[PDB]
Amino acid sequence: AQYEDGKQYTTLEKPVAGAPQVLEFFSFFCPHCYQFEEVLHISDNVKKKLPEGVKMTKYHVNFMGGDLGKDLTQAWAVAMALGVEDKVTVPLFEGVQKTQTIRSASDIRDVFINAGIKGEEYDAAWNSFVVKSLVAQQEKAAADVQLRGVPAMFVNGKYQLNPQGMDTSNMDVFVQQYADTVKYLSEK
């Protein structure tokens, strides 16, 4: 067939009940994740092609970058809680990988401040139990799918995208194949 299990996607032998419809994992330390988000805009092109009524969830992971890596999962929880993801995603990626000016929790905080989030507001969120549970949600989703590498995308807790079965000669064409595959899986 055109889409075949084991080629553009794999099926989880051990399906995850109650998972988000479309779930993407990344790390701000992850070089391919930087490409995905900053150069390819995968999340966005996927979204533009998802059928109506299917929402997109994106979580940060702990297993890259050590201590700063966990800080970034907590910051991403703050980003989700305040709804400021589209204001901090670019400066966090560039701060960690381009300028390498993010070296501490305080440097992460600076990015949110630069972005117009008030200090009081950031700190209150950082220390909140609502953010603690969002950190918990991210860690559990990653644990549920055996997650050991990023970037990664899962559809309905049952299917995992397999971009390595895709031509990358053209960047535009790869992104749409990726997006079209997510839509296919989402209609399954």
Which of these, 156, 183, 179, 184, lies nearest to 23 by C-alpha position? Answer: 156
Distance CA 153, CA 43 (A): 10
Angle (nearest 5°) at CA 97 between 123 and 121: 10
H runs (alpha helix) in 48-128: 66-82, 85-93, 105-114, 119-126
- Preceding peptide of 163 cis, ω within 30°: no
For 58, 133, 159, 162, 176, the CA distances from 15, given in Å and listed in that order, are 19, 23, 8, 17, 26
Resolution in A: 1.9
Angle (nearest 5°) at CA 179 between 149 and 52: 115
Which phi and psi angles does 164 have, rounded to 5°? -70, -15
Distance CA 88, CA 111 (A): 7
Question: Which tokens in the block code for residue 145?
Answer: 């799918």
Helix (H) or strand (E) run with residue 23 in it:
strand 22-26
Which of these, 83, 78, 79, lies nearest to 129 by C-alpha position? Answer: 78
Whichever domain contains 175, its CATH number is 3.40.30.10
The whole domain housing 37 covers 1-188
Question: Which tokens in the block code for residue 22?
Answer: 């479309």
Measured over the CA atoms of residue 148, residue 90, residue 113 and residue 77, the dihedral's sign is negative
SS3 15: coil
Which of these, 85, 81, 91, lies nearest to 135 by C-alpha position? Answer: 81
Tell me 5's DSSP state.
Answer: B
Angle (nearest 5°) at CA 96 between 93 and 101: 125
Q: What is the largest CA-CA distance in the chain?
A: 55
Structural domain count of the chain: 1
Tell me 146's DSSP state.
Answer: T
* 111: amino acid identity, one letter: V
Distance CA 65, CA 128 (A): 23
- Half-sphere CA count of 181, side-chain side, radius 13 A: 27
Pairing between β-strand 22-26 and β-strand 9-11 as defined by DSSP bridges: unpaired
In 84-182, beta strands by DSSP E:
152-155, 159-161
Distance CA 75, CA 16 (A): 26
Question: Which tokens in the block code for residue 39?
Answer: 């150069």
Which phi and psi angles does 155 have, rounded to 5°? -115, 120
Which phi and psi angles does 26 have, rounded to 5°? -150, 170
91: left (phi over 0), alpha (psi -120 to 50) or beta: alpha
- 66-82 helix and 105-114 helix, angle to the nearest 10 degrees: 30
